[PDB]
Amino acid sequence: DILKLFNEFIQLGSDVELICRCLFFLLRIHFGQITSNQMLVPVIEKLRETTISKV
């Protein structure tokens, strides 16, 4: 859920640095588990496009 909510926050363009610091910390610590779950595939695709585009 938080990854979906983070996607909305980056697109609005408000408080990007705090969310980006929060976002990158979750991805590293759950890197092994996130890869296995196929349900999270669409979320990362949307996150991948938004994150680099906004920064």
Partner: protein, 62 residues
């Protein structure tokens, strides 16, 4: 429910509220690459191996 094995990755700290147990991060020895937070009673350091009867319960939950 089969017996589970976990390895301690990071030692967080002592609860204070819940006696004097230690919150630790544990990752399962299976190739599932999962990781949860558990409460340990007694001296524990990084690299220890823990035996879990129940792998579903989480230390910090609502």
């Amino acid at each position: 429910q089969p017996i589970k094995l976990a390895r301690v990755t990071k030692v967080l700290g002592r609860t204070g509220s819940q006696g004097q147990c230690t919150q630790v991060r544990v990752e399962f020895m299976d190739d599932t690459s999962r990781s949860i937070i558990r409460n340990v009673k007694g001296p524990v350091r990084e690299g220890d191996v823990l035996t879990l009867l129940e792998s579903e319960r989480e230390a910090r939950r609502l």
